[PDB]
């Protein structure tokens, strides 16, 4: 053999160390497999699916690729044998938003899933972290932590870090000033009922509610509250034009897979139960600021809203929670 | 305005020292976009293409993910003024092959598109590199150069970067070994006509037909001639599998887009004209392995081809120039 | 020739040119930082120890097939430094054991009239980003020599006091510096001014948590934390004999956001003349947005009396030592 | 107290998964310190050494910098335990070669000093790869792994990486393009003894040799020869310069820490046993083609010489097997 003329084998070796496992190969589950392998968060990345040929054009896509990557093993199986030693499974796969469509529409079909999915992933990674990012994702988090039997700490909701982002982007334009240096903090569902935190935001440290104090109110003479408008409304408007959304969530995906990968210990707005918080008694899933390393989300900062701030918040509890309590699983 | 009250002014405000355009956003120009941004290849990213709803809502997606990016501006239009002052101006726009049809089948339909595309880029950018990713590429780095009006070294096909690639990945899989460490060349035609140049595989500068005379033949007993005939089908196989390619040539012109930002002086091997080598007359373009740069090619190596690879390569050129000739534009 | 065998040539300036002034330890750790985070297409070395020069440039070159960066060159002659985009001022007696950054300030002042014009003639439009100290003083004074426009001419001020604050806090709360949030104005060194009132995590400012954050009647002492901050350059100096890779990264993260024309805030060492009352020409750090014309925009920070007190102290010190020297 | 006020804390550590450590905070230490800090290889860093001032100091020097890193645990003591759990130890250090003394003449102290480092520094660390980088580096990765008692696989030592990066270095000057793209071998001894493997010497697999079969002989007309007399005189030229070598080493050894801790499988030229290989029969250590990756070196590339370059490497093995038996365990 060609190989053993060239090359001296010195040992039979065995598991990766930072393995990476994506359920899901739609468009959303593709831009957190390249995002991942663009930022080296891995040793081996594995796929899985349901659709066969799909499945294999994306592994095959990804692997030609190799030479100018640093993952050296790409995978994909219907099997989830493939995902076997994982450190994270995200979980992207289920129904996705049409046109004008809530996330919130999409429950009961992506339960149903997740009652396939969660099992499995459980059975070959035991100890992995769960990032789920199918939708409504707020919901989803409390259904894979029920259904996995994992601690809460090992179950995350990509949750609002994208609406985070989308926020500070947009005050970014707004003030020609770069994201990285324009601070505010979207907290609650990932969707419509969103809760920009004004009294957080920021450049700099100085306080843009302590220039304007009528910032993100109807009184406001610049109309702020419309930057929280288009980052509810941004997911529709990209939907609209181009069918789905992909590569901000990607992004925003591989983000916190590099806070747990590489434990961090960076603050991101992601889905947690919040029972204890603002008076708030039930197992609710929604977004608050929480630091996020290898063993997932350890502590969760205490924001102080105002009292609109926390009335929003606790009705965004409560429309997850008017649907998470009936859920059939 | 809130903005004054926060930031003094002290500098009148810009021109883009690192733009790259994607003409395109179809899966491809999408794919070679994103790659690019998680590079850091571009101070400012410009999209065109002529489905205007795509077109913003890409552009969108795209603005979104800024936050966990290093490119501060991202812009699209139809018009193509907003592709002003690049540095690099890659082009995927055009028809794509179907499932049993040759990348030879488009020419009519891209050298049209090219008509207009061509001069409206060379309008705005008078210093870039064009890099052609379109297919069939090596035709369409020809035609791109006699309707731009600029030198040879400054229009680059992305060629055989790709079969390269995909050539090594399939190589260091047989072999245990990672790409980066697994050497070989395809040249010629990106297409049915490549060549393998057997004579130059290696690891470590140890040719694998020293160790094995057949490497390479149909008497192969381990039929290395198969990896080839897998580097020609990739993209058919990919295509029968997930309905087109994306990631893996995204990455191939990132490597190219990298080379030529960063004036690194590497070797690919990328569509340029081959008059004067291997007996060639004619102006055909064709794969071989290029000198890359600031100036995009400088200079070409002249590899050493046995009778056999030498005769399939002028093959290759004959049959792009049977192509070539009968263009009118 | 053998390469004319293997190679046809069709073709017979640097986009992206860095030069470091000063191959000391600063200096380097500037350069190694710059070649690993892909900045440069070129880079040029400048000193007038020649052996040092040229050793340091060699061992630079050496491990090229790991960098990104193809041209690394080295001069006494500034010919060397044209077409740079950014040149980095690290020259100059350094920082000593027990002693203040300000007991360096006419020896570089001196230095400066030697460089500055050199640097100048060669790169006329590049930014300037001084570092050797003290950093404010030296910043105006390249600013007054140079003739350059204020924008280009940048400090790397007080964005190593801030990153030094910032993991300080992070040890403290146990959150990545990333994610703790904090700014140190005013000079880099001894009259540095924390501005607890924009300290914060997740937009939840610490002092709303307790209202005395950083005074003396502070339960929790976290004025010591700036302490910390203030002491850092002395404490290392003592142990290894000078700083040099909090500082390489610091000016790395500078040159990234020049570089790259990111816009991002940083607080460097810029004039404040006009800001609380100020009448004359001193450089200190304030929030500062840089980008490719270096210093395009000044955040105005809101300062309490206390924090505001305390930066017009800082400007008095400054202006003091400023007033008295001659160039 | 303020912490708890504002963080709630919601679970109790685990150990580091991707640890380094550097034994020496010399020139040597230091670079490969920082190198490995901006290429984001560990989530854990650990110093010892015995100079505590020293020790402290640089620890301090990196930790400052903290806020542009990705690496949350930087720490230090002259106490090995400080180094528990690592994945690779990496040592640095020992007395260092004046000008006019051979590394092989740092043999005696080197070895004094490994018999105290290497059982405290293996202690700690089950999983470790140790990797060696003081000199002289082929008999000091004989003498680690003696010491040990680890298998051959887990003991590397930095070799010849940079005297091929050296040569590669050198070749791409002289032709004009970038090391990346100039292939060659330096092997044997990282010292006066390395011989360069001229018939593996090739730009896109042109054998440099096959333009001119004089190539390095003291016929060939262009003196290669003395491109491999400056890889053997680098260190010694940089020494009698600025007093020292740190910063192309460190990127040496990062380059291999890169290979190990992302298991890519690239080949690198590295201290490693050769018994058995070229009629050697005795358990010499010297620089061949490695494979390298999580386990360390798991195969061997049998690279073939001509009957000169054989012979050279054959008098290097004859050099160090000659020290070998010099040492006093
Ligand atoms: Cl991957 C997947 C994707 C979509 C639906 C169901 C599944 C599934 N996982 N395990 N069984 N079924
Ligand atoms: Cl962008 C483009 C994409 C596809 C077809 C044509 C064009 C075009 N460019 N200039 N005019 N038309
Ligand atoms: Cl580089 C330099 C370094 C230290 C002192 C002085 C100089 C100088 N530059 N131009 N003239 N002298
Ligand atoms: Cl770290 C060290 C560095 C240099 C010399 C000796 C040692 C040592 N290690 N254990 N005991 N002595």
Excluded at 276 to 294: A, R
Aim: hydrophobic share 40%; glycine share 8%; proline share 4%.
């Amino acid at each position: 053999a060609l190989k053993d003329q060239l090359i001296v084998n010195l040992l039979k070796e065995e598991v990766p160390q930072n393995k990476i496992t994506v359920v899901g190969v739609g468009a959303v589950g593709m831009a957190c497999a390249i995002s991942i392998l663009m930022k080296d968060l891995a040793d081996e990345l594995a796929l899985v699916d349901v659709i066969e040929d799909k499945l294999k054009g994306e592994m095959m896509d990804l692997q030609h690729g190799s030479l100018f990557l640093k993952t050296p093993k790409i995978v994909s199986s219907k099997d989830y044998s493939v995902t076997a030693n994982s450190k994270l499974v995200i979980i992207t796969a289920g129904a996705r938003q049409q046109e004008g469509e809530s996330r919130l529409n999409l429950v009961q079909r992506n339960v149903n899933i997740f009652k396939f999915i969660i099992p499995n992933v459980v059975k070959y990674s035991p100890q992995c972290k769960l990032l789920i990012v199918s939708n409504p994702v707020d919901i989803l988090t409390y259904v894979a932590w029920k259904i996995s039997g994992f601690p809460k700490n090992r179950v995350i909701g990509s949750g609002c870090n994208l609406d985070s982002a989308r926020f500070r982007y947009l005050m970014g334009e707004r003030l020609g000033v770069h994201p990285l240096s324009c601070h505010g903090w979207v907290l609650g569902e990932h969707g419509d009922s969103s809760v920009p935190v004004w009294s957080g935001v920021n450049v700099a440290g100085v306080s843009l509610k302590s220039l304007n104090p009528q910032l993100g109110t109807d009184a406001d003479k610049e109309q702020w509250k419309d930057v929280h408008k288009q980052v509810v409304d941004s997911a529709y408007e990209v939907i609209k034009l181009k069918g789905y959304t992909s590569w901000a969530i990607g992004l925003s995906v591989a983000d916190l897979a590099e806070s747990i990968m590489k434990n961090l210990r960076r603050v991101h707005p992601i889905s947690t139960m919040i029972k204890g918080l603002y008076g708030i008694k039930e197992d609710v899933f929604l977004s608050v600021p929480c630091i996020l390393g290898q063993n997932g989300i350890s502590d969760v900062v205490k924001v102080t809203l105002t009292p609109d701030e926390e009335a929003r918040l606790k009705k965004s509890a409560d429309t997850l929670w008017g649907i998470q309590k009936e859920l059939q699983f």
